[PDB]
Design a protein around this ligand. Sequence first.
Ligand code: MG
Lengths: 380, 1341, 245
Amino acid sequence: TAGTPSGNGVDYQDDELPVYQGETTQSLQDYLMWQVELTPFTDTDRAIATSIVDAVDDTGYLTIQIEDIVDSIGDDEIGLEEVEAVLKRIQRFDPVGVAAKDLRDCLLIQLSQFAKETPWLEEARLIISDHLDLLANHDFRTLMRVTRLKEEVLKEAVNLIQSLDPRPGQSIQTGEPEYVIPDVLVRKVNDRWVVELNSDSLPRLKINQQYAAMGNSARNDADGQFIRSNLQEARWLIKSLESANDTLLRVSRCIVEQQQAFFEQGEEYMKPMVLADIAQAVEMHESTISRVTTQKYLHSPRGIFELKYFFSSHVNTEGGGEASSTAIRALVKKLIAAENPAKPLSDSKLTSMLSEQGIMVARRTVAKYRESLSIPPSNQ
Amino acid sequence: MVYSYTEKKRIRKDFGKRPQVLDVPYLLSIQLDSFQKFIEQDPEGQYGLEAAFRSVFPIQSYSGNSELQYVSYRLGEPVFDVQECQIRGVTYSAPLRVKLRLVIYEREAPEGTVKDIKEQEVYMGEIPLMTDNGTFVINGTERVIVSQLHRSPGVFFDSDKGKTHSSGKVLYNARIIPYRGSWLDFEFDPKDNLFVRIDRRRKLPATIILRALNYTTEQILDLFFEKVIFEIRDNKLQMELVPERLRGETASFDIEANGKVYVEKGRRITARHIRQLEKDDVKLIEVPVEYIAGKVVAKDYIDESTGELICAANMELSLDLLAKLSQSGHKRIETLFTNDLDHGPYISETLRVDPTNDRLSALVEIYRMMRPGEPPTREAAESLFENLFFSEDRYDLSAVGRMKFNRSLLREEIEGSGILSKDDIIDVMKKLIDIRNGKGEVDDIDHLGNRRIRSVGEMAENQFRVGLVRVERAVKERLSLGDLDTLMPQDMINAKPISAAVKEFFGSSQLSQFMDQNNPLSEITHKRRISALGPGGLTRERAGFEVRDVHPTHYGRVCPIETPEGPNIGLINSLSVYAQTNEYGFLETPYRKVTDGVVTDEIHYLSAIEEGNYVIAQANSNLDEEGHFVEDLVTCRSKGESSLFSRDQVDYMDVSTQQVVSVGASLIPFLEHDDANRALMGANMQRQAVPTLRADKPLVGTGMERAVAVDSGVTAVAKRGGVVQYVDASRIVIKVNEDEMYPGEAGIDIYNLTKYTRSNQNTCINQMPCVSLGEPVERGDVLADGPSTDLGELALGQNMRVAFMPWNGYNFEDSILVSERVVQEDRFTTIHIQELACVSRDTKLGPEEITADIPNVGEAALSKLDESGIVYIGAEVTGGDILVGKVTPKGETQLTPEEKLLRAIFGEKASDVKDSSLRVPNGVSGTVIDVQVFTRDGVEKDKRALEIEEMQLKQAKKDLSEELQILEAGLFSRIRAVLVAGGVEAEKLDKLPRDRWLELGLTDEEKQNQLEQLAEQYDELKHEFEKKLEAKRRKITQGDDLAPGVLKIVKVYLAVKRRIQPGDKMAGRHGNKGVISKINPIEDMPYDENGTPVDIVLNPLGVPSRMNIGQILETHLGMAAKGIGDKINAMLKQQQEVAKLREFIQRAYDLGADVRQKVDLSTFSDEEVMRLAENLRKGMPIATPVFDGAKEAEIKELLKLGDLPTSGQIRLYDGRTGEQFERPVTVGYMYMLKLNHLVDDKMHARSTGSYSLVTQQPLGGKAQFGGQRFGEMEVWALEAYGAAYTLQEMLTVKSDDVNGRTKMYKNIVDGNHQMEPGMPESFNVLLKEIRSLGINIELED
Amino acid sequence: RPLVPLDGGRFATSDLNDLYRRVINRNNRLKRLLDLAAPDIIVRNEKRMLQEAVDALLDNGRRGRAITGSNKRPLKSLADMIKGKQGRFRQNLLGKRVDYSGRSVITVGPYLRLHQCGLPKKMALELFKPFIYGKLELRGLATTIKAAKKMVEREEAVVWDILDEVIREHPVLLNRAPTLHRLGIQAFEPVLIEGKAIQLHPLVCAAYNADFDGDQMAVHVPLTLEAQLEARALMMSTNNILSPA
RNA sequence: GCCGC
DNA sequence: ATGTGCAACAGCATGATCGCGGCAAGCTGATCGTGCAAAAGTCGTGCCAGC
Ligand SMILES: [Mg+2]
């Protein structure tokens, strides 16, 4: 290891019997409640505020409908007029624009809190925000004619609109990106692409279990011998862990054996291996292998970090034998990106190109592969 | 000659009064020597890795006819040097290569072999190495290892103070302690019964072990007692005469000698009667039969008539038994001594208690007592007893253990079997019985002759031995299933447990801690530190009042002054300056041999045991020119005591007066004038000083500053010093002179000084040159001075002008008053460096990218970020600025219409990717110093990574091309000389390149030999430089093998300047400390008649109660030194000629009452005199040794030389009123340090923050924004006040009332000031806890 | 009894979780083995195992020389971790940590009165944050709590003026760590000073047993009318002049 | 654990 | 004159041993396979409605 990181921030509660205790974190909902508790609200107003802030998502938008909120209250004299006022009061909290029903309302409230003298206040308050939002989504070439305004002014109005916060309330999150990858399956490149395993800790567990259980048993302070009281539990644990590591290593070796080409030369060279393919290889049932390799993670220089991403059964009626739809999707993404500025990428045209390349796939499937992680480049 | 180049620039005026015999040692020899002995190869199997390998290897399987033969070993070159190892954050270690061979023996032919595979060396683990300063760079840290003071293995006899049974009976016990194995013990019952406690188990009689050694009852009674013979023939019943044993006894009847009365019945028992009886030669005489009634038969006489016999040992005899033995013909009866004057009844009682008399019975009994499990089958007992003691690999006393064992029992032989035999246990039991009898005495366990020292090498050797045993256990299994195809790497080399054990010992141990990096003094003190704690040591709470007390044997070995205060006082000590460790591991101290009446120059090192017999004189006893003592009666130490002896009875003399003080205590001037505990505090506080912006030498020093500065290693010392060629703020290149030179390739010395670098305590480490240009230097001279060092002298403080006077209560108690001029000159201003790092780590949802553009971040925040997202070097960041722009991906594979239009309106990401950027922690400010981005192999190089690689390549080429330029210049000069010898074109030849086409051919010999060889050497030099350069380029440009998860690493350093302020702490080196109370303006401080204000004002009230006269003496001496410096400065100001200035300096350097310094300016060059005088403008740095130095008369004449009053006190005027203070005030210069306790780290406040999930109470401590703890005593005080509402608001509203907190905050914001209390969460947690047991507790109505 | 999180998504069970899991495992194994008509020896062994697990869970460190585990340190059972030292020391019975608390090094102020102490303005403005929020919202300088919070964050000049107004007659109490008697905690009237050190009146040092060579004190705010009156009329430094011993 | 009171 | 009852001594196990604060340092993991119905879930393929 040429370069090693310094130790990451960590601590454990000491001089306290309930070790590690805990530590409270402030979320968006907690901050919203804290703000609510410090503004003059009636009891009904407080109840409505709590009900509507309970429905605030992680991004800061309301998930439930206002009429559904009124139904949730389930009390008379709490008609939608009152809840509308309460929600509109709530919107103007520290993350200005939080608890917004839609994008239009969020931009309207964000633009509301201003000096009322900005160069393009009325230009984008309702002409652009409250109207022709779908036009602004596209190139908005006809938007200038629709709003009877010059394109030069719209060029700055669009920038002013984009200056606002798209998703308010997401700057409050206190979670840490600690969901890093153990990569218990390490792999290096060799003459045959050997696969090893790290983070086993089996010798350490064996030593600790010995020094505790067999340490107490070998200690002569207790009368008699604890030949089975403590000694014959560490053996069972060690055997179980060894068996688990053995089957994991066997499954990983089978996976690399059947998927050597994905790792060699081009990345998109995965065969459509099924659960039975590994089941017959390891002489074990498919259910155990599926339960074993469903979130275990490998560390590859170029391949993806997963053990279920390779497990695809996507024969797709290929011309020569069978193929995998993962490679088909990768090829479609590569070809769609590398196209003309018009970029037709028609479903029928893409299917014809794939068939010419040798992938006999229907024109309706390719639309699904494209829509899974992309959009048609004006193919309609 | 007399003075070195680095010393002629500034010479301390030593007051001396006594010559020095031997110089101070390396001050770091213990750690260095121990690790050297651990690492280096040894032809014999004495110690180290070779010793461990020979201990385990060779090894063979269980009759498998396959062995692994071990031959030699080596350590590979480290793959990183120290500096880049620290900058990377990795361990500095070397690979361990071991060469061993596999031999396969013939199964059919006994003692024959069929195969012998001599495979090459194999690798198991990496052994960390120590730096040149005795530090172990592990995980990019320092981690010094502290030596341990433990009990030497052997035999120790103790009396437990004789207060256990409350009867006044003193109990003696004996313990046998091996280096590794199970303890053995013997104890005395209050009923006088021999009991053993093996492995600290239940007490059993010694007779079981004594019989287990194949010893019959007759034999034990014979060996453990002096048997006498009773002869009963013809009814005479005579007795053998032993007058020597017959000392105290009462005559039961008349005693006659050869028919003549010698001693009457109940006659005189005095020594005269015994002497008279012994003088007369008397054979056996008859005795009354009543005496034998109390006797006990020892042997087991056999009856010749019948097989029946009286074999009942340890039993008396009956009257009928006399007739029974007479009938059997027993003329002689063997009976033990049974005499109780000095001897007594022992061993026999233990044999009466325990009836087992067979080896099998004893073995099974000890097997049952040791192991209460399964009973043995005549094989478990034998094997277990063989495993307990007398086993080669189970029980083992070291050579020191055998030495102590043999010495304590008075055996001439020192070396012996490392395993205990049958005879030594018997000898130990006999010795214990002897101590009980009266002869002999118990030994002191706190005696320094019974305590050893374990250093780093021995501990590492033990850990490696344990790891190699673990490896061997696994290795042995495979050999049973071994074919011929297996090699050594395939024979379970098993690097894993070797590496695991070694790294676990080094990185995580009690005796391997972070080293202190404030000053070089703290590093020096920490390196040579003695600790009683540790794995095999003594815990804090197990320590009595006697183990933490100073002993008369601590004289020249450990310091009685330097020790921590509260918990660890007496448990952590420091080595004396001259102390060193014996071969066995015992402390030693030098002494001068004394022959007749003249002390000799030869020096002997004596340990704690040897020095106890001789008579040792005192260091400060006057001697004449010839070495004789000037007085008849001198003070000496004979045996732990002090008294006056004759001039001829002495045997040794102390080497010097510093023998009893450590390095830390040696730097306190006038130590003999300070109280012991206050000097202890001063010595302990000298190590907490913080290096300042600019170093300042002490005006009043001791002379140990040079040794501490050089030996610490912070400086840069020349090693083959010639002349200085190129100087720079970051490099010194020295052209080594011709007199010493390695043949070939010429050669120069390149020193790369370490610039501003973060230390362990977040201080600054910086080196700056001391040589100017073309200045000749010698070997060992100082080139650069590190942190807190001025011209090679330890300077960790500043010279402050001090007035001792009360000033309007602003120096009340221990506070300090400081002028603003001290603040203006940036004195006591220190640089602190901080390290912040961020890591880009892979996730399931995607990789983590470091990019400048951050979603939902304004353009103002990105101002101080480059195109790659890393701060520009030199940018000043404060508060919560962003350092590294990092984005974390988010997962969404369902494109709902709202997200679709979000992506349409905004960027393609539409800010889905969250941001997790490294921001400066609140309250932290400073300038960005360095960025050290690291990248993985294969990943795209960062934009700034190219720039750093370019700068590294430029530095490497720049420091590599100098020697190439020198070598090519030499080759060109040789070629020019050759062409001058023949066909010289002079400037015409010099103008054309390549020596004008090598000057054609000229003569045949020159063309064939000279020119051809020159061209060949030139081409070889080019090729050599080119391959070395591409090797450096390849080494520089590589992909670092990061962790499997991480992808990129960025490290950012911030540097800030901390100035002095009222909250800061300042202290001198005499135990006088305090905090600043006010920073006074210049015109408000007192001034003398010359208008010069003072810098510091202290209280006279703190001197007498604390008993620090060194304070006042150092103040006067500093005033005198600064007066001489002022005289020199004034005389240099007026452009006075060199003659008068040299005269004045010579006069000042010859003062004192017969000092031992002989500095003379007659031989000094005029330029040297000018430089030295220009170095004394700010003061003359005189030096006083520890226990001898300047006296009152010498200080007063020093004052009189500089035209200052001899009283040391002047007239001060009040800077506010203009009036003169009524009494004279003591003014002078005192060396004041700045401790590491500042209010920028001690100021905290909180109103609301985070609470724990359990008990819902606020967190604790700074950096978590915690609240102050309102403990039990504070609540007791509140109860005693009667403040019930304050207490209730403390217990409920402020801590645990979850609803109460919010309600009270809402009331405060509204302005209600109402409580509305409730139930603390802690009581609910306690109720749930108690209910979680089988117990019900409830809150009834 | 939360379980400790580690690097990544991994979770490490605490000692109580380990004891409960072991008890559950032994109980389940005994239950499954009872129905198999197994010989009475293994039934006896499993019943002893379940009993030992129960005692280890309820009271570790007795009858079996403790269970320990994974660090050669005894596991913390239910009783061993009741409250601090098995009693009620740490987070109950007067062991609470409190909000509105500060701490810094003390120096000497000779100009002070017997009832006055010097309080740094950075130590203030943090203890008195909700009071400043209330005074800002009440005077009309900031309408919403967010505006007042942001303005206090930016620490403008009127914020300092309002802080000086709100500290006027609010007593504050200082205590020293080894509280030996009731005079080790006293209430003073804060005075705003510039710096980071508390200025303590010299005449109370003897009662506090305080010296200016590096000591520190703790500052607490009595944030209630009853608490303010108690701090003024009971614990003021002018109130206690004779020692209650 | 090291240090400060 | 021998036998029975009671008080005392020695051994053993249990419980406790001042606070408050700042650096620091290690992570305390997992588990098991079963072979099968039973269920739920998923993918290649063809459909009608909008441009
Ligand atoms: Mg103090």
